[PDB]
Amino acid sequence: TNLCPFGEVFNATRFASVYAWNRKRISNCVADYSVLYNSASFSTFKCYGVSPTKLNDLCFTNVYADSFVIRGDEVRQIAPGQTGKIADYNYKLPDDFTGCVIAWNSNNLDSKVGGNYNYLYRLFRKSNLKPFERDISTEIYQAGSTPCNGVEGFNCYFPLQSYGFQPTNGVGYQPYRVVVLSFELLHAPATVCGP
Amino acid sequence: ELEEQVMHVLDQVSELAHELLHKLTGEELERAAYFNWWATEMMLELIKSDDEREIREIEEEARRILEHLEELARK
Ligand SMILES: *[C@@H]1O[C@H](CO[C@@H]2O[C@@H](C)[C@@H](O)[C@@H](O)[C@@H]2O)[C@@H](O[C@@H]2O[C@H](CO)[C@@H](O)[C@H](O)[C@H]2NC(C)=O)[C@H](O)[C@H]1NC(C)=O
């Protein structure tokens, strides 16, 4: 049996920044979801539309795995009907989302002594994101009526901002790895089935 | 919990300043954008730094800012 490569999604050595989340397409494989939903290593495992225990008897056309790193207190924004810095400018889910949001603490990986500043999120944007939209532009944001001309300075900001992840952070601002599994069923044969 | 106590107020500033980015126009918006940026920048200096006096100075400024932002939200 050709099992779906979930080990390349969860046990990945590197996760993307939330402003530029990494999408992997899962297709034409056997998807065992009882391996993840029994590990008891996840702090969050919330499924919308599909029951975690019924998940395995369903066939889909494609399954998309969107991965990124955010703060613990920001995990609540990875859900339908939410607003906030992440929900609006970095990663937006649809109100009719069908899928599972899985997250766990990576304080032993994504934190460093002196502070790990390699993770970024979008601080400013002209408008809110649409569902599953991404924006990787670094064009300088104009806060007022005064033109920036691509120059950062007074009333002109670089649109991205870093996180400060260190081992001794409070739980709310420790780093968390998030994987969102989106399940879609189209007209195509539906090649992603469980055991 | 001194370091954590300060983060609490810095986040409150960033959250309120963020909401105001969809409400305010003109100078009021520009001002809110600054405060938003300030809070998220100070969250990085809070973690990196030392000396209790620097930590308290950040808190006091953050609290003045939060109260200021609420004057924009109510109007
Ligand atoms: C993600 O990896 C964990 C751990 O895998 C082990 O440690 C790695 C560093 C590497 O050495 C692997 O080859 C090891 O297997 C997986 O958790 C294990 O899952 C197996 C199978 O169910 C179980 O027998 C082990 O006891 C689990 N170990 C622990 C510590 O829980 C986990 O399943 C992987 N995630 C995915 C989606 O594959």
Side-chain angles (χ1 to χ4, degrees), chain A residues 1-13 15-26 28-33 35-42 44-50 52 54-56 58-138 140-144 147-148 150 152-161 163-186 188-195, chain B residues 1-3 5-26 28-49 51 55-56 58-59 61-66 68-70 72-74:
Chain A
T1 183
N2 55 326
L3 301 172
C4 293
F6 285 121
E8 297 183 22
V9 176
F10 290 85
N11 279 301
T13 58
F15 277 59
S17 296
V18 73
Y19 83 90
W21 41 273
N22 186 32
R23 170 167 284 188
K24 182 177 178 70
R25 175 173 177 271
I26 305 299
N28 197 27
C29 59
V30 178
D32 187 350
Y33 299 99
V35 39
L36 299 170
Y37 193 63
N38 276 303
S39 292
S41 65
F42 299 116
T44 300
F45 200 112
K46 294 178 179 180
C47 297
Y48 302 88
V50 293
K54 301 299 183 177
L55 182 63
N56 209 42
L58 300 174
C59 294
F60 304 107
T61 301
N62 296 296
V63 183
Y64 300 97
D66 294 348
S67 62
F68 49 87
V69 178
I70 58 172
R71 290 184 295 157
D73 61 356
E74 293 176 325
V75 172
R76 69 174 298 282
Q77 290 180 47
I78 311 302
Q82 304 301 302
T83 63
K85 183 65 76 183
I86 302 301
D88 294 311
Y89 296 160
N90 292 273
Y91 184 77
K92 177 70 175 173
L93 295 176
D95 290 347
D96 57 339
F97 175 68
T98 300
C100 300
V101 179
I102 302 100
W104 64 101
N105 188 303
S106 60
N107 193 62
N108 63 318
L109 299 174
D110 294 331
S111 290
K112 294 186 178 182
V113 175
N116 183 337
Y117 301 100
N118 290 330
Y119 287 100
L120 291 99
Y121 68 97
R122 185 171 296 278
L123 180 63
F124 295 108
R125 195 168 192 268
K126 290 179 181 177
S127 68
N128 298 337
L129 294 174
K130 294 181 179 181
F132 299 117
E133 187 178 2
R134 56 145 57 190
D135 186 342
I136 61 169
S137 170
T138 56
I140 281 77
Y141 179 85
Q142 183 187 359
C148 298
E152 185 177 7
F154 185 67
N155 303 331
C156 295
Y157 301 95
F158 190 75
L160 304 177
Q161 178 61 285
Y163 289 105
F165 294 132
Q166 71 173 7
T168 59
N169 280 350
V171 51
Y173 53 105
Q174 284 185 11
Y176 281 69
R177 287 175 175 201
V178 180
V179 177
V180 181
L181 303 178
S182 172
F183 302 116
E184 75 175 2
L185 170 288
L186 307 175
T191 67
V192 182
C193 299
Chain B
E1 294 179 0
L2 178 63
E3 183 180 350
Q5 186 173 17
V6 173
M7 282 296 297
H8 195 71
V9 74
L10 287 171
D11 281 355
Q12 288 174 344
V13 171
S14 76
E15 289 176 356
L16 179 57
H18 176 67
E19 289 179 358
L20 291 170
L21 294 176
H22 299 85
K23 295 181 180 179
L24 303 176
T25 302
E28 288 180 340
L29 177 61
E30 186 180 83
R31 190 183 305 153
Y34 172 79
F35 286 134
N36 189 160
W37 171 86
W38 180 89
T40 58
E41 188 70 14
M42 293 309 291
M43 289 176 208
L44 302 172
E45 291 187 0
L46 188 24
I47 302 180
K48 61 180 180 295
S49 74
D51 297 331
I55 299 309
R56 289 295 191 187
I58 294 169
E59 185 186 352
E61 187 173 3
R63 287 182 182 280
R64 289 195 297 271
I65 291 167
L66 183 60
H68 188 84
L69 288 171
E70 290 187 357
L72 297 170
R74 71 179 69 186

